[PDB]
Write a protein that binds this ligand. Structure first.
Ligand code: ZN
Ligand code: ZN
Ligand code: ZN
Ligand code: ZN
Ligand code: ZN
Length: 757
C-alpha cells in the first residue's frame, strides 16, 4: 500500500489515459476515525483528487474533441488553451532555472491583462506536442503586464519535466493548458501535508479520537495568575481557573456572553466560539489577545520568546484584526504577505522590517560576513519574529512558510473565520508545539467551496474543521445578543434559523426609513426568468428595473450612496444590474453577489432573488446557510423581491413567508409615502410606476416661491427644501440698463451688460 506521501501530487499518465478510479473515503462526520494515519490519507486523497479531477476530465474532453475542428472557439470551463506555444530561451533566476515561453496573441486581443486571472504567478501549466502523450508540468514564475501583452511568460519547470527538457527543440510547438483553480492554495498545503508527520499533529485525542473531553492548556498546570488592568483601563493577579475571581464585564466593556466566551477561550486549550452575524467577534478577539499578551509570564516558560500566531483566510480580515489590536498594542506586530492594502500595517511588513539602517547595523557580524562572501534571506526572518508578540498570515501563507513556523514553534494559534477554512488547511498550520488553538467563526453561514460538486456532496469535503467538531459534539460556546439588525429583520432569523437570539437594546433605537410605510417589505411577482447562453447563471429584467428604480428613489431621500448597497444571488443578474447602472447617477453604490459579500454590512440592502419559473427549479437558494447569509446583511433597510409561490416548497422559505404574512410586510405592490404630503400613498410594482415620483416626492408641482420671485419648475422634491442649490430656468427679465431693456439671460444667471451698454 502506497503511503499518501509517496502519492505523486501531479496527475500521472495512468490517471488520465486509462480510467482508473483512485480509492477515496468520505469523511466520517458522524463518528471517530480508525487511525490518524488513515485520517491524513483520506484528507490528502480528497484534496488531491479535488484539484486533479477537473484537469484529468478536461484533458479527456480535449483528446476526445481533437477530431472536432472547432477547438479554438470552444470555451472549456475548467481549463484554458494557448495555441502555438514555443519554448524560446532559458534564464537564470534567484529561485533556479526559468524558461521564457511565448504563446500566440491573436485570439487573446480581448484579454485585458491588468485584471485577468490567467497565468498568474504560481499556476500549473501543462505542455505537450503529441496530443498529451507526454506532460511537462510547469509553474508560472514571473509575469509582467507589458510582457503578457506580447505573449511571453516565465516558467519554472519541475524536476521530472526538466529531464524531458533536455531534448526539446525551440521549433517545437506545445499546447498550453492551465487549470482555472488557483494552484498555490492547493500546492503549499499539499506539500506541507505530505511533510506532516503522524506524531506532530497535535490534539490527536480530540480531532481524530472524537472525545468530548477538552482539558485546560498544559501550561496552566504549572501555575499562572493574570492581571486584567490593561483591559479595564485601555489589579491583583487572578487565577483564571477560578470563575469567581474574574473582573467585571462593564470594566472590560463586554456583555455576559462575550465575557463567558473570553473566559472559556482563555481557560480551555481547544475552545470553539460560535457567533451569529453582527454579534461581534473581532472585539472578543482583541480582548483575548490583549489579556494573553499582558500576562506573558504565565505561558512563556523559557527565556526564548514564542509569539502569538494569528492566521486567517482573507487578507482584509487579517488587516482589520491587526488594526483592532493596534488600539491596545502599538509595537511588535509583524505581518507576512505583500497583498496588504492597509497603510497602518504597511510599516510592519516583512520587507520594511528588513529595511531601516539600524537593522543593517545591528545584524550579527557572522551573518554579515556571509552576505559579502536563499541563506541570507533566511535567518533574517527568524530574528525579527523572535522580537514580536503577534504574527499574521493567511492559511496559504502559513502552509508556504511551514518550516519557519516549525522553527519558531508558536504556542498560541488563532484562526479567525474558522468556518471558512478547509480542514486540510488547518492540518497544515498545526505544529507539534501547539498547546493552545482557538477557533472563531459561524458554521451556520457559508463554508469553503469545492471545485467539484460530487466530493462536496457525497464526500463532505465542504465540512470545515469548525463544523466537524461542532457535529461530533465537542463542547462549544454560543455568542448571544445581536447588535446589527433591527427587531423586524431579526424576527426572520428567529426561531427559523437560530432558536435563541436576543436583540441588544441599542437596536430598538433604529429610526424608520423615510418615504415608505414599511422598513421591511417583500415584493412578490411572477415574471419568468431569462436564461443566458453562457454560464449557468440567471437574471431577471423586471426585478433589475424595479430595484434600480427604488435605488434611484432612495437617493432622492438624502440617503448617501455609501449607506446603500445592492445584493443579488447570481452573477448574471449582477452583470444585468451594472447594465442598468450609469455611474453618473448612482456613483458609490456597490453591487456585489451574496457569496462575495460575506462579512460586509450596510445601512440598506436591496436583495433580488432572481429565480422565478414554473418548473420549480429553485437552484441553490434551497440551502439554509446561504439564506441565513443573504437575509441578515443590512442594519435598517430590507427591501426584497422574489417569487413566494415557488419558494414555499423549501420549508425554511415557507416559515419565512408565513412570518412575513403575519406582519403584512409582503405583497405584490410596495406602499410608498411622500414626505411633504404624508396623506398620499403611492403603490409601486413596476419600473414604469416610478414616473409618479420623479424627484421622490409627490406628483404635485413643487409650487415653492424661489427667492428670485419665480416658482420651482421641478415637481415635489424633499431634497434641498431651501432650494439654495436650485437654479431658476425661467427668464430673468430684470432691468439692467437705464433704457429699460430687460435682461435676456436666465434668471439664475448673473445679469450681463445690455447687448446699449
Ligand atoms: Zn409631495
Ligand atoms: Zn422646488
Ligand atoms: Zn438679468
Ligand atoms: Zn427666477
Ligand atoms: Zn440697454
Amino acid at each position: 500500500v502506497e503511503s499518501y506521501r509517496t502519492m505523486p501530487i501531479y496527475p500521472t499518465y495512468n490517471e488520465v489515459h486509462l480510467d482508473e478510479r483512485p480509492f477515496l473515503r468520505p469523511n466520517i462526520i458522524s463518528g471517530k476515525y480508525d487511525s490518524t494515519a488513515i485520517y491524513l490519507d483520506t484528507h490528502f486523497r480528497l484534496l488531491r483528487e479535488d484539484f486533479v479531477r477537473p484537469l484529468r476530465e478536461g484533458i479527456l474532453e480535449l483528446l476526445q474533441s481533437f477530431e472536432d475542428q472547432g477547438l479554438r472557439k470552444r470555451k472549456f470551463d475548467d481549463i484554458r488553451i494557448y495555441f502555438d506555444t514555443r519554448i524560446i530561451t532559458p534564464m537564470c533566476s534567484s529561485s533556479g532555472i526559468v524558461y521564457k515561453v511565448q504563446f500566440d496573441t491573436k485570439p487573446l486581443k480581448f484579454v485585458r491583462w491588468q485584471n485577468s486571472k490567467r497565468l498568474l504567478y504560481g499556476s500549473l501549466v501543462c505542455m505537450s506536442k503529441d496530443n498529451f502523450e507526454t506532460f511537462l508540468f510547469a509553474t508560472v514564475s514571473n509575469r509582467e503586464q507589458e510582457d503578457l501583452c506580447r505573449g511571453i511568460v516565465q516558467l519554472c519547470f519541475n524536476e521530472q519535466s526538466q529531464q524531458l527538457l533536455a531534448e526539446v527543440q525551440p521549433s517545437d510547438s506545445f499546447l498550453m493548458v492551465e487549470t482555472t483553480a488557483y494552484f498555490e492554495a492547493y500546492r503549499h498545503v499539499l506539500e506541507g501535508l505530505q511533510e506532516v508527520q503522524e506524531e506532530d499533529v497535535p490534539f490527536q485525542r480530540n480531532i481524530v479520537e472524537c472525545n468530548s473531553h477538552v482539558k485546560e492548556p498544559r501550561y496552566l498546570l504549572m501555575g499562572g495568575r493574570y492581571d486584567f488592568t490593561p483591559l479595564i483601563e485601555n489589579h491583583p493577579r487572578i487565577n483564571v481557573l477560578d470563575p469567581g475571581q474574574w473582573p467585571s464585564k462593564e470594566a472590560l466593556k463586554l456583555d455576559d456572553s462575550q465575557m463567558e466566551a473570553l473566559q472559556f477561550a482563555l481557560t480551555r486549550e481547544l475552545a470553539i466560539i460560535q457567533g451569529p452575524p453582527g454579534t461581534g467577534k473581532t472585539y472578543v478577539g482583541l480582548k483575548i489577545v490583549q489579556a494573553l499578551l499582558t500576562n506573558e509570564s504565565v505561558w512563556q516558560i523559557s527565556l526564548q520568546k514564542f509569539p502569538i500566531l494569528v492566521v486567517c483566510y482573507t487578507n482584509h480580515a487579517l488587516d482589520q484584526f491587526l488594526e483592532g489590536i493596534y488600539n491596545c498594542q502599538k509595537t511588535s506586530i509583524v505581518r507576512v504577505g505583500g497583498r496588504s492594502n492597509s497603510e497602518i500595517l504597511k510599516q510592519f511588513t516583512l520587507r520594511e522590517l528588513r529595511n531601516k539602517r539600524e537593522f543593517r547595523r545591528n545584524l550579527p557580524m557572522h551573518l554579515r560576513r556571509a552576505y559579502m562572501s536563499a541563506e541570507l534571506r533566511l535567518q533574517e526572518d527568524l530574528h525579527i519574529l523572535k522580537d514580536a508578540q503577534v504574527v499574521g498570515m493567511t492559511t496559504t501563507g502559513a502552509a508556504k512558510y511551514r518550516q519557519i513556523l516549525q522553527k519558531v514553534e508558536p504556542r498560541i494559534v488563532i484562526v479567525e473565520e474558522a468556518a471558512e477554512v478547509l480542514e486540510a488547511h488547518t492540518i497544515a498550520t498545526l505544529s507539534k508545539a501547539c498547546q493552545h488553538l482557538i477557533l472563531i467563526g459561524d458554521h451556520q453561514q457559508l463554508r469553503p467551496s469545492a471545485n467539484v460538486y460530487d466530493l462536496a456532496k457525497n464526500f463532505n469535503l465542504e465540512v470545515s474543521l469548525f463544523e466537524r467538531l461542532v457535529k461530533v459534539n465537542i463542547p462549544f460556546v454560543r455568542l448571544n445578543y445581536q447588535h446589527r439588525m433591527c427587531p423586524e429583520i431579526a424576527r426572520l432569523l428567529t426561531p427559523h434559523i437560530y432558536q435563541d437570539l436576543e436583540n441588544h437594546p441599542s437596536v430598538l433605537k433604529y429610526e424608520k426609513i423615510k418615504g415608505v410605510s414599511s422598513n421591511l417589505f417583500f415584493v412578490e411577482h411572477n415574471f419568468p426568468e431569462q436564461e443566458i447562453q453562457e454560464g449557468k447563471s440567471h437574471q431577471n429584467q423586471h426585478e433589475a428595473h424595479f430595484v434600480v428604480e427604488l435605488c434611484k428613489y432612495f437617493l432622492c431621500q438624502e440617503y448617501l450612496p455609501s449607506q446603500i448597497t445592492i445584493l443579488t444571488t447570481y452573477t448574471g443578474q449582477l452583470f444585468c444590474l451594472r447594465k442598468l447602472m450609469p455611474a453618473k447617477t448612482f456613483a458609490g453604490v456597490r453591487v456585489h453577489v451574496v457569496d462575495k459579500y460575506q462579512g460586509e454590512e450596510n445601512d440598506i440592502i436591496l436583495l433580488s432573488l432572481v429565480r422565478s419559473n414554473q418548473e420549480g427549479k429553485v437552484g441553490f437558494l434551497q440551502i439554509s446557510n446561504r439564506i441565513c447569509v443573504a437575509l441578515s446583511r443590512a442594519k435598517k433597510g430590507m427591501y426584497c423581491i422574489g417569487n413566494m409561490q415557488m419558494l414555499a416548497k423549501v420549508p425554511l422559505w415557507s416559515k419565512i413567508i408565513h412570518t412575513l404574512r403575519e406582519n403584512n410586510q409582503i405583497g405584490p405592490m410596495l406602499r410608498l409615502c411622500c414626505q411633504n404630503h404624508p396623506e398620499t400613498h403611492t403603490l409601486v410594482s413596476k419600473a414604469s410606476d416610478f414616473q409618479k415620483v420623479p424627484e421622490g416626492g409627490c406628483s404635485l408641482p413643487c409650487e415653492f416661491r424661489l427667492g428670485c420671485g419665480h416658482v420651482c419648475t421641478r415637481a415635489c422634491h424633499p431634497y434641498d427644501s431651501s432650494h439654495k442649490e436650485f437654479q431658476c430656468m425661467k427668464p430673468c427679465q430684470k432691468v439692467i440698463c437705464q433704457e429699460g431693456h430687460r435682461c435676456p439671460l436666465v434668471c439664475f444667471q448673473e445679469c450681463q451688460p445690455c447687448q446699449c451698454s
